[PDB]
């Protein structure tokens, strides 16, 4: 499923990401935009055999299990296929765990590059929440 900008902001707010660990809502919307273009089906295979899954491009060597990643961890304790659902709940719950890792949203390269330090509120401007 490809979410609309405001449609995604609404779902993430529902799921409690607004100001989660101090990150206002637009941070998460901006992260999804550049990580997956708001597509819950986005997958990107990496040279190490791992794959990034879903709306927030969560990696199979550390966060979920896709059975193709040899000696990997599964820190969110879920099958990576769970991160490809129309329902972003699994992705949001795992993202909460990732952002509680010790470095906040810096764990997302795309957020660090395209969102960190910008006017993230613009990503929710014009939306009804």
């Amino acid at each position: 499923k490809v979410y609309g900008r405001c449609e995604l902001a609404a779902a993430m707010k529902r799921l409690g990401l607004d100001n989660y660990r101090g990150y206002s809502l637009g941070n998460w919307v901006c992260a999804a935009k550049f990580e997956s273009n708001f597509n819950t089906h986005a997958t990107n295979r990496n040279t190490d055999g791992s794959t990034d899954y879903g709306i927030l491009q969560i990696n199979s060597r550390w966060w979920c299990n896709d059975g193709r990643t040899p000696g990997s961890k599964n820190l969110c304790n879920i099958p990576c296929s769970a991160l490809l659902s129309s329902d972003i709940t699994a992705s949001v719950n795992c993202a909460k765990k990732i952002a509680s890792g010790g470095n906040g949203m810096n764990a997302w390269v795309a957020w660090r590059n395209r969102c960190k330090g910008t006017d993230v509120h613009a990503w929710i401007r014009g939306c009804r929440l």
Partner: nanobody, 133 residues
Framework: DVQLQASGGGSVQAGGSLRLSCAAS????????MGWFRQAPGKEREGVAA????????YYADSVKGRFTISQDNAKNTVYLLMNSLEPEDTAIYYC??????????????????????????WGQGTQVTVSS
């Protein structure tokens, strides 16, 4: 409260080889990246080699490609830097470093290596390497 302990180093004649080692302890999860940076008195600090602990993909400064090799024991959160065909220009204080961030999406450890050490948050005390003529 993680610690990076390095071994190896010292003096060696040009053309010679040295292997440095660095063990990361105190981690429960991670580190995500381990690498070596070097600093010679009158130069900019240089990222020499790095490796994604998860996966083993490696990265190298152009100045050492084909001469140096970084690898991990993994089983013990330890990495090795095998340096062959040393030149006097390789003389420097070599530092083991690590990036403790567990990234959400795939991250190439060579990025922080080539951009000033960005993301490498933990550092060893430095090991002198002197390559004599």
């Amino acid at each position: 409260d993680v610690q990076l302990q390095a071994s190896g180093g010292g003096s060696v004649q040009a053309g010679g080889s040295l292997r440095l080692s660095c063990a990361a302890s105190g981690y429960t999860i991670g580190p995500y990246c381990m690498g070596w940076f070097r600093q010679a008195p009158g130069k900019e600090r240089e990222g020499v080699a790095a490796i994604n602990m998860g996966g083993g993909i490696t990265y190298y400064a152009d100045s050492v490609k084909g001469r140096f090799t970084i690898s991990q024991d993994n089983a013990k959160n330890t990495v090795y830097l095998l340096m062959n065909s040393l030149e006097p220009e390789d003389t420097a204080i070599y530092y083991c470093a690590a990036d403790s961030t567990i990234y959400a999406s795939y991250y190439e450890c060579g990025h922080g290596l080539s951009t000033g050490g960005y993301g490498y948050d933990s550092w060893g005390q430095g090991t002198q390497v002197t390559v004599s003529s």
